[PDB]
Coordinates of C-alpha atoms and ligand atoms in Angstrom, one line a residue:
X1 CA 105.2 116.4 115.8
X2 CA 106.1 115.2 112.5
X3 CA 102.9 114.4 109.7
X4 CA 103.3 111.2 108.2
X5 CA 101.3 109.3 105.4
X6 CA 100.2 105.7 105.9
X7 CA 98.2 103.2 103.4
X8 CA 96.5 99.8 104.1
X9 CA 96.8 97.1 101.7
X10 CA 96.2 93.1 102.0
X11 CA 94.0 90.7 100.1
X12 CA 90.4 91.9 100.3
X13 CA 88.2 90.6 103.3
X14 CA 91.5 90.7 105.1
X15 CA 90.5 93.6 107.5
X16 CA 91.8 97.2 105.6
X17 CA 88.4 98.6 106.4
X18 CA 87.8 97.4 109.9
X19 CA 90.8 97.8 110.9
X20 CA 90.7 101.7 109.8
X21 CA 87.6 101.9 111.3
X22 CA 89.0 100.4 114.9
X23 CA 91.9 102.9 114.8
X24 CA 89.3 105.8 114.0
X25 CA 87.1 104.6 116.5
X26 CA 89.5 103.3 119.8
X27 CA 90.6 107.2 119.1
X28 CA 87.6 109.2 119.3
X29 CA 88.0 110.3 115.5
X30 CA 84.9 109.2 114.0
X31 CA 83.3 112.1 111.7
X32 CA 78.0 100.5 119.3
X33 CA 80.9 99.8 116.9
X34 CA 78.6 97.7 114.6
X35 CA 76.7 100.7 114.1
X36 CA 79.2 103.0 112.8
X37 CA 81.1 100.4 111.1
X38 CA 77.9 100.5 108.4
X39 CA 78.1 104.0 108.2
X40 CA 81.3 104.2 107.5
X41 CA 80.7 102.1 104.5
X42 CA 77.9 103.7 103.3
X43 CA 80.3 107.2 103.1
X44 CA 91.3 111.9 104.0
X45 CA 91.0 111.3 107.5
X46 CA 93.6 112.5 110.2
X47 CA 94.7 111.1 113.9
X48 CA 96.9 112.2 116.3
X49 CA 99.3 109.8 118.6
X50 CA 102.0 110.9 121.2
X51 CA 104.8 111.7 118.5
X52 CA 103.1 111.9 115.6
X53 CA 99.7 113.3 113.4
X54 CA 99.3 110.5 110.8
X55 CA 97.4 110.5 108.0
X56 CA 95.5 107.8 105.8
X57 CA 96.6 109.0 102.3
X58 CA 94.8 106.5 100.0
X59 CA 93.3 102.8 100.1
X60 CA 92.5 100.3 97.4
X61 CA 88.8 99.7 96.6
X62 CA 88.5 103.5 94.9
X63 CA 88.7 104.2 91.1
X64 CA 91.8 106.1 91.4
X65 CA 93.9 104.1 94.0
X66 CA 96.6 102.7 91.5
X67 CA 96.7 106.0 89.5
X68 CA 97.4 107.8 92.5
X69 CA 100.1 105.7 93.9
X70 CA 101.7 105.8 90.1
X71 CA 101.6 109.1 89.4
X72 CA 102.8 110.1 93.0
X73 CA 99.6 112.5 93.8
X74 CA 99.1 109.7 97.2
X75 CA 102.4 108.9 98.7
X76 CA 103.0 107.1 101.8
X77 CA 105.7 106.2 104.2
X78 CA 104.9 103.3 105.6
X79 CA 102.3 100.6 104.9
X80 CA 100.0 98.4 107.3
X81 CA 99.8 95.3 105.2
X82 CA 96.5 93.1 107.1
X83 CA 96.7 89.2 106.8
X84 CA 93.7 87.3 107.8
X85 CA 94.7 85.0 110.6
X86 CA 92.1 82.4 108.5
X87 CA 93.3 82.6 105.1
X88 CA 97.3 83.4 105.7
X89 CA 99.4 85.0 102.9
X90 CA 97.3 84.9 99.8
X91 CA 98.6 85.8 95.8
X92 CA 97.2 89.4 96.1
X93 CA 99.1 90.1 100.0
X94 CA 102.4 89.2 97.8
X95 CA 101.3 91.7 95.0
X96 CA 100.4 94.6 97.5
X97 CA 104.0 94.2 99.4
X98 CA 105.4 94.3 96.0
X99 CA 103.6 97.2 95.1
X100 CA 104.9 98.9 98.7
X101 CA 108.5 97.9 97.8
X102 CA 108.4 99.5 93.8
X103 CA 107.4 102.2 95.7
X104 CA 109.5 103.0 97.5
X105 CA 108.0 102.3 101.1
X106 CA 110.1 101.7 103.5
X107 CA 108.6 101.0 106.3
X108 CA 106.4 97.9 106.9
X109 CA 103.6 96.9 109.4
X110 CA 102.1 93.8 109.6
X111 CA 99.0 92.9 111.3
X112 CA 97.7 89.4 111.6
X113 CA 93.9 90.5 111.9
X114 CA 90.5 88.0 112.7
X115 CA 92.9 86.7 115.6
X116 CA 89.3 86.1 117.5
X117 CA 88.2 83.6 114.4
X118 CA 91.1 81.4 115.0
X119 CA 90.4 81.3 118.9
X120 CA 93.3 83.9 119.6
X121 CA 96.2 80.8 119.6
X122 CA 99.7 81.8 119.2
X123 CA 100.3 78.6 117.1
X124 CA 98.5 80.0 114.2
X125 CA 99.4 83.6 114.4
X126 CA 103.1 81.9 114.3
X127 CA 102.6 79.4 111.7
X128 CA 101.2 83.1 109.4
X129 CA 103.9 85.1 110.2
X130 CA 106.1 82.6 109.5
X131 CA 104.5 82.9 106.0
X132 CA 105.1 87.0 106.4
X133 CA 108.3 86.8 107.1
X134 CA 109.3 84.6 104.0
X135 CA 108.1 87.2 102.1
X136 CA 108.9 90.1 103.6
X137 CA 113.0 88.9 103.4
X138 CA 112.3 88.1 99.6
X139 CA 111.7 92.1 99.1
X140 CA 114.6 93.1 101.5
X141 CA 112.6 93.9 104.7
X142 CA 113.9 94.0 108.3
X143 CA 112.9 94.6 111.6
X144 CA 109.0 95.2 111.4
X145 CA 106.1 94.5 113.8
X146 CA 104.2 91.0 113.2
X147 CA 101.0 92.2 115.0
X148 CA 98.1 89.8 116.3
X149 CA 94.5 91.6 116.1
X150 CA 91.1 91.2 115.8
X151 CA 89.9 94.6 114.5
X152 CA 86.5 93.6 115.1
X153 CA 86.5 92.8 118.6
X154 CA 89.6 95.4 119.4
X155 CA 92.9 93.1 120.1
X156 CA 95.6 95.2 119.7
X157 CA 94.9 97.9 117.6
X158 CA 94.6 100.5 119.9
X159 CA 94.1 98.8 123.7
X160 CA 96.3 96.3 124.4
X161 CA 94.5 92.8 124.4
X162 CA 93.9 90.8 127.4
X163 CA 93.2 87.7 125.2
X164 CA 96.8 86.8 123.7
X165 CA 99.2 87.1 127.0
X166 CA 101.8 85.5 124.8
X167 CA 102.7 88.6 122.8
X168 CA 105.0 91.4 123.7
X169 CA 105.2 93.7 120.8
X170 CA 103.7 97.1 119.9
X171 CA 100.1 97.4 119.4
X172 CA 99.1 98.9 116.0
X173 CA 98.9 102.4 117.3
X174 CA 102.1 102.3 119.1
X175 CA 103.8 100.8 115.6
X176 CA 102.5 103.6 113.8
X177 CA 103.6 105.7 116.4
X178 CA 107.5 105.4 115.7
X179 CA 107.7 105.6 111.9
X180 CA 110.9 107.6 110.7
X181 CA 110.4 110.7 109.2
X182 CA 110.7 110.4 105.7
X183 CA 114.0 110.4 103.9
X184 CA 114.7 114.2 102.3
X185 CA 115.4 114.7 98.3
X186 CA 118.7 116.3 99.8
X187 CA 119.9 113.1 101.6
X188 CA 119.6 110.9 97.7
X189 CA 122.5 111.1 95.6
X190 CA 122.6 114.2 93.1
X191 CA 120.4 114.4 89.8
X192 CA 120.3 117.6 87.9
X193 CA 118.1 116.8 84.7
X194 CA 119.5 119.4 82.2
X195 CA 117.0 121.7 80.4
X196 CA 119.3 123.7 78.6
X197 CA 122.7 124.5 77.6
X198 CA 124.5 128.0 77.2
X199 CA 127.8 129.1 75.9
X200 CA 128.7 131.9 78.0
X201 CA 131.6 134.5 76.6
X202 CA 134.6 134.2 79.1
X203 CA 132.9 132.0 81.1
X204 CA 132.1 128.5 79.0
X205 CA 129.5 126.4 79.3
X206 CA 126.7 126.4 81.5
X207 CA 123.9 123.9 81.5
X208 CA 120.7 124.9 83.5
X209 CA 118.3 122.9 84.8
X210 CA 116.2 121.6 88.2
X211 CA 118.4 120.0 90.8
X212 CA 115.8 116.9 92.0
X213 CA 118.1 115.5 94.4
X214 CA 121.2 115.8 96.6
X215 CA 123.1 119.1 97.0
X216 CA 125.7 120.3 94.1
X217 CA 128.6 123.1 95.5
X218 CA 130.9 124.8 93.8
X219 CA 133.8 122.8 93.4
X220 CA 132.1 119.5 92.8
X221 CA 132.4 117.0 89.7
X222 CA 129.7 116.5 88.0
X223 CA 129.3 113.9 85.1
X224 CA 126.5 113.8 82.2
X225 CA 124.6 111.0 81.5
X226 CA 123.6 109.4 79.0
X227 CA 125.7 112.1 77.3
X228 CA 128.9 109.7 78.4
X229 CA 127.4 106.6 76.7
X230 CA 126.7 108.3 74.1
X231 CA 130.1 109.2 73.4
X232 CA 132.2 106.6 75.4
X233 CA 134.3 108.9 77.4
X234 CA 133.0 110.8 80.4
X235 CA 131.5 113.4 79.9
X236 CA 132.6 115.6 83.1
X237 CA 134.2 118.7 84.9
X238 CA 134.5 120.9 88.1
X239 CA 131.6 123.6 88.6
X240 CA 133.0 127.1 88.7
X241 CA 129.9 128.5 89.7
X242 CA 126.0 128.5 90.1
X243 CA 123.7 131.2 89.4
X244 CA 120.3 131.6 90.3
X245 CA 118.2 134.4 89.2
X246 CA 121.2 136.2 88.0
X247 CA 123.0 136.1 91.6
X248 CA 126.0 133.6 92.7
X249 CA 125.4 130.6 94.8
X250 CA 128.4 128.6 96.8
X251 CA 125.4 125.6 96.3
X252 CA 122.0 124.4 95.4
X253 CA 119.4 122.5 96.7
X254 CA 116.1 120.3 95.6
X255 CA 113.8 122.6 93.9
X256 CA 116.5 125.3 92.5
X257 CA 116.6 126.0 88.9
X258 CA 120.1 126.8 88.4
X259 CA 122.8 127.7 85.7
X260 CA 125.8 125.9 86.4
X261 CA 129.3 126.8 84.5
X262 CA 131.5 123.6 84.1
X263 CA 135.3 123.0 83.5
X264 CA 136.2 121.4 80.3
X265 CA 132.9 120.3 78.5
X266 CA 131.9 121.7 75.2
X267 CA 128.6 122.6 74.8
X268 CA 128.2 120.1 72.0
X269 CA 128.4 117.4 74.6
X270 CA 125.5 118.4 76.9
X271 CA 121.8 118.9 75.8
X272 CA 118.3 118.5 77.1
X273 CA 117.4 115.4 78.6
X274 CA 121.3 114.7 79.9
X275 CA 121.2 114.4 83.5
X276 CA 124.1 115.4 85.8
X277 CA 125.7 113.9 88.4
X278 CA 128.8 112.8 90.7
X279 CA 131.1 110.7 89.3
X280 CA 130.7 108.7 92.8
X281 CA 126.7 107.9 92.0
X282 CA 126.2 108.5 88.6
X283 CA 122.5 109.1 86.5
X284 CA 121.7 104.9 85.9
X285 CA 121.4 104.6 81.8
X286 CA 119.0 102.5 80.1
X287 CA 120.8 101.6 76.9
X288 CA 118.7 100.5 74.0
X289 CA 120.5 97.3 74.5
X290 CA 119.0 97.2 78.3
X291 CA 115.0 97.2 79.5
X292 CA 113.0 98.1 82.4
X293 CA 109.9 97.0 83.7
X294 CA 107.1 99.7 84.9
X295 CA 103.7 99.8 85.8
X296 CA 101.5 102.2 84.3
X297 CA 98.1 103.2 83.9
X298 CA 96.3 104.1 80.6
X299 CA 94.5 107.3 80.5
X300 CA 94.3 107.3 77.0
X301 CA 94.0 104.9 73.8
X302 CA 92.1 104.9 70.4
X303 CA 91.8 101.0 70.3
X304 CA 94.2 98.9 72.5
X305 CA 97.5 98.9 73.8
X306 CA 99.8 95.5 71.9
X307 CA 103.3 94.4 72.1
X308 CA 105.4 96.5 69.8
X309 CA 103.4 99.6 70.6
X310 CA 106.5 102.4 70.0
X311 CA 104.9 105.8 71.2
X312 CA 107.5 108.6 73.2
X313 CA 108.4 108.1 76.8
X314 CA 108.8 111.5 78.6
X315 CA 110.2 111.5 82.0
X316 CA 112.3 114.6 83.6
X317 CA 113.4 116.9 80.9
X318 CA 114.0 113.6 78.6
X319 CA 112.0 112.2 75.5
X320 CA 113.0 108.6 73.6
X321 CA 111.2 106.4 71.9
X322 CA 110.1 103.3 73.3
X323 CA 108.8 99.9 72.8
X324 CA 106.5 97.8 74.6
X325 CA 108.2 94.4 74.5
X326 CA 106.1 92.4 77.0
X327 CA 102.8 93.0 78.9
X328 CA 103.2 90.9 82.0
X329 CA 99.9 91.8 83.7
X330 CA 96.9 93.1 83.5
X331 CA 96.2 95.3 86.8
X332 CA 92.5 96.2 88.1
X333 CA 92.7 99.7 88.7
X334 CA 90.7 99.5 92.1
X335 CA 93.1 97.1 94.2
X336 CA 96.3 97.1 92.5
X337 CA 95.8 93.6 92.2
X338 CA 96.4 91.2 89.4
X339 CA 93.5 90.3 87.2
X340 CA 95.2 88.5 84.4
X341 CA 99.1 87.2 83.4
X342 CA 100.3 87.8 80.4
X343 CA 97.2 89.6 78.7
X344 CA 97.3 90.4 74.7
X345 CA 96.2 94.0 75.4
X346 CA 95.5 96.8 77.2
X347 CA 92.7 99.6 77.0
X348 CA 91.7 102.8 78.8
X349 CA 91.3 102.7 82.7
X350 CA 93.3 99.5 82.7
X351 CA 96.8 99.4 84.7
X352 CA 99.6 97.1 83.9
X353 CA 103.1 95.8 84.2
X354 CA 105.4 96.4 81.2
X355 CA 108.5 95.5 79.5
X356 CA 109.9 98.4 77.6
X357 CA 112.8 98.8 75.4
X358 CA 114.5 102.7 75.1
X359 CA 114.7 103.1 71.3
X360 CA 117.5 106.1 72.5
X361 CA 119.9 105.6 75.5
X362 CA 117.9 107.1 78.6
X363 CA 118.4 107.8 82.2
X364 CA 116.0 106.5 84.1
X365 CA 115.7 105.3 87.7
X366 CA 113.5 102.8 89.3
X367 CA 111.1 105.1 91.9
X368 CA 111.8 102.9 94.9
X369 CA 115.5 104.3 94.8
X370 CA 115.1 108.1 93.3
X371 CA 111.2 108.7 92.5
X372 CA 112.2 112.1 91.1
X373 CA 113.8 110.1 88.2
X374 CA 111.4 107.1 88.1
X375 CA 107.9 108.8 87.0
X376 CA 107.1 109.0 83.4
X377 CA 104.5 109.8 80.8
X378 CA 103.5 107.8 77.6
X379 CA 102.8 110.1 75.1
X380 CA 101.5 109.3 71.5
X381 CA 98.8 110.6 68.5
X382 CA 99.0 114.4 70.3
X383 CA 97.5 113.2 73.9
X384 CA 99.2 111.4 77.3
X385 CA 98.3 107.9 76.7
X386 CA 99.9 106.9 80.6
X387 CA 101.3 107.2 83.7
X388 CA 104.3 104.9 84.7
X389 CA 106.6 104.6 87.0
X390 CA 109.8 102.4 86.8
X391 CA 110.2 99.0 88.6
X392 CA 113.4 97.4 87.6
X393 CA 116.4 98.2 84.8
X394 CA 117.3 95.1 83.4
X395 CA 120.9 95.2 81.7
X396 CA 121.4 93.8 78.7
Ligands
GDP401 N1 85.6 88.3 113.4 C1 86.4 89.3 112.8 N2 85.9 89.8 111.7 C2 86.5 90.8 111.0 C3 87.8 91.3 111.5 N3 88.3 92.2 110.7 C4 87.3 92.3 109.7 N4 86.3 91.5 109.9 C5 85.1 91.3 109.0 O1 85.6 90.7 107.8 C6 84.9 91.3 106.7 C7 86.0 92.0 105.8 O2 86.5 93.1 106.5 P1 86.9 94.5 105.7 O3 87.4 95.5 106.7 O4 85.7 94.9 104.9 O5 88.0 94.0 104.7 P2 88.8 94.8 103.5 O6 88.2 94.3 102.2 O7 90.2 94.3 103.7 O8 88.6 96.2 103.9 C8 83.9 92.3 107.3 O9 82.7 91.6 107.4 C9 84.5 92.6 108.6 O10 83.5 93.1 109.5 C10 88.3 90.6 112.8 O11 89.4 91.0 113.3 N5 87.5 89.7 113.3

């Protein structure tokens, strides 16, 4: 049985708790429902379906939820995003499924919850997910469950309801039940963040470094970035070889640090920070010329955080300069949910969304596509000011 993460989001009041707390319940995994449902309250936890042991990673409405989904330390892969049958889409359910697809989640499952307060009828369920599917399209999702439930009295989390004859889809625990196994580092396009560079004698040059994704073999092309921007002409050659702890490999794989000899580029051309890849899906570049937007949390911060704040962005192997351009929101830590547009500052604890401007060209990529790539610290006056991860790469 394969172990996969799941997180709740959804305006708050929607159901995340109850809903939880049916699943738990309806599966005799609690550590009168009423009763219970207070204790519960007052205090991660596992189940176990047919094909799968699913875990509840993280939920908003804890200090740390937001840094934890940032900073990667609470990853899921796939969210249950509740809508109240009463209130239909709300501002903070669009925030939390853009949260799911920055990301990187790709797989989505709605429930349209407090079906019992709205007398169980199929035209409202219909009319909101209507409202979810609008949405969902706008972000690029396909082909996930639009479930009717009442957490509270049991519809259709885990025992099929007897109250709403006009649905035919999964229950909650069934949709959960068949969530792909994640995608693998080794199935993402190549990205070899380069920590060093050597000049071998009768061998040539030989960058090491972490491969992070993707599979490199001898015999490949591999080209530098932003090394190739840098000097407008790629940057690129054939590996002759890999070596790992002084042996040969014919390849490596995510997680090997590797030396890597390759045809035809000077060791001038390469340094730390360059990232390698093949000429097919090459490392994205943020030029100075482009931006990206991020979301971050500050850990750390003398005063406040301003537009045209220039401390060092680390990500990878990597360090630029970089320049906060725009502060779009102001994030409560808790939910993840927007507390304020366009705010003048920022202060420790508070999370955000960013525009920043590379002072140097860097690569960076946005975490929904390569993660490995997309995390970054903000680092400034000898401490880590934040934690960020990218949204967007706006071109110039
Ligand atoms: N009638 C009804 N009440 C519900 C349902 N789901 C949640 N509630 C109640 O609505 C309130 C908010 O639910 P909660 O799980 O705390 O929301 P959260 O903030 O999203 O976790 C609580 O009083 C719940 O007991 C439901 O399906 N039907």
């Amino acid at each position: 049985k394969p172990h996969v993460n799941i997180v709740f989001i959804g305006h708050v009041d929607h159901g995340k708790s109850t809903t939880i707390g049916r699943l738990l319940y309806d599966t005799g995994n609690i550590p009168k429902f009423a009763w219970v449902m207070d204790r519960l309250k007052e205090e991660h936890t596992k189940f176990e379906t047919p094909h799968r042991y699913i875990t509840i990673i993280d939920a908003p409405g804890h200090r740390d939820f937001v840094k934890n989904m940032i900073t990667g330390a609470s990853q899921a892969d796939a969210a249950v995003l509740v809508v109240a049958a009463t209130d239909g889409v709300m501002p903070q359910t669009k925030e939390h499924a853009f949260l799911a697809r920055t990301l990187g989640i790709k797989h989505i499952i709605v429930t349209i919850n407090k079906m019992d307060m709205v007398n169980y009828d199929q035209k409202v369920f219909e009319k909101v997910k209507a409202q979810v599917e609008k949405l969902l399209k706008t972000l690029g999702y396909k082909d996930f469950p639009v479930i009717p439930t009442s957490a509270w009295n049991g519809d259709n989390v885990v025992k099929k309801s007897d109250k709403m004859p006009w649905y035919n889809g999964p229950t909650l625990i069934e949709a959960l039940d068949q969530i792909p196994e994640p995608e693998k580092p080794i199935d993402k396009p190549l990205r070899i963040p380069i920590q060093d560079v050597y000049s071998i004698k009768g061998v040539g040059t030989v960058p090491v470094g972490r491969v992070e994704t993707g599979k490199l073999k001898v015999g490949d092309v591999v080209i530098f970035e932003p090394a190739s921007t840098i000097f407008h002409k790629p940057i690129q050659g054939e590996v002759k070889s890999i070596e790992m702890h002084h042996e040969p490999l014919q390849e490596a794989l995510p997680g090997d640090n590797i030396g890597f000899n390759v045809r035809g580029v000077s060791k001038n051309d390469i340094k730390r920070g360059d990232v390698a890849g093949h000429t097919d899906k090459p490392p994205t570049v943020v030029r100075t010329k482009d931006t990206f937007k991020a979301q971050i949390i500050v850990l750390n911060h003398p005063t406040a955080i301003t537009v045209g704040y220039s401390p060092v962005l680390h990500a990878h192997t990597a360090q630029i300069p970089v320049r906060f351009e725009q502060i779009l929101a102001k994030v409560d830590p808790r939910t993840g949910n927007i507390v304020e547009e366009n705010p003048q500052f920022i202060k420790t604890g508070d999370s955000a969304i960013v525009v920043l401007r590379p002072m140097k060209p860097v690569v960076l990529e946005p975490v929904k596509e390569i993660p490995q790539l997309g995390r970054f610290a903000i680092r400034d006056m000898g401490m880590t000011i934040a934690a960020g991860m990218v949204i967007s790469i706006q071109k110039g």
